RNA sequence: UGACUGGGGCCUGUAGAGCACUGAUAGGGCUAGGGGGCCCACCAGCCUACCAAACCCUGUCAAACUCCGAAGGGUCCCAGG
């Protein structure tokens, strides 16, 4: 799977519980933090959900 | 095993729409009664740009109407986590 690279770039302060929890699923705690993740449809499913807080690249 | 997410299988009567049921409805057709002119009381008879059921056509309304009906949500299984 051509790996996904994600960066948290907006504060989740003010968004719903579940959205903050998807970030948690991903392992994104801090702002500007980047994580490299395999491209399974469950990984994608969550990143879909927090699309508006994250920029996404391919590796 | 968690929150959250992917793939499946059930359950549901809202948004929206509709008039088959319950009721409401504007106009026209068709047509019981009743009013009233022609008229005879021996009771019949003909007409009326009157009020008007039931029924049909056109046009619509409804938390306590529904022939119909999403997005979603609920739950169970397999996974990621």
From Swiss-Prot:
InterPro entries: Ribo_uL30_ferredoxin-like_sf, Ribosomal_uL30_bac-type, Ribosomal_uL30_CS, Ribosomal_uL30_ferredoxin-like
Source domain of life: Bacteria
CC per GO annotation: cytosolic large ribosomal subunit
Assigned keywords, A-Z: Ribonucleoprotein, Ribosomal protein
Listed PROSITE patterns: RIBOSOMAL_L30 (PS00634)
Transmembrane stretches, start-end: none
A Gene Ontology BP annotation from the UniProt entry: translation
GO molecular function annotation: structural constituent of ribosome
Family named by the database record: Belongs to the universal ribosomal protein uL30 family.
Quaternary context: Part of the 50S ribosomal subunit.
HAMAP family: Ribosomal_uL30_B (MF_01371_B)
Protein name: Large ribosomal subunit protein uL30
Source species: Thermus thermophilus (strain ATCC 27634 / DSM 579 / HB8)
Lineage: Bacteria, Thermotogati, Deinococcota, Deinococci, Thermales
Gene: rpmD
């Amino acid at each position: 799977m051509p790996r996904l690279k994600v960066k948290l770039v907006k504060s989740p302060i003010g968004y719903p519980k579940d959205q903050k929890a998807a970030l948690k699923a991903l392992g994104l705690r801090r702002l500007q933090q980047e994580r490299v993740l395999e491209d399974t449809p469950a990984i994608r499913g969550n990143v879909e959900k927090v699309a508006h807080l994250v920029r996404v690249e391919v590796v």
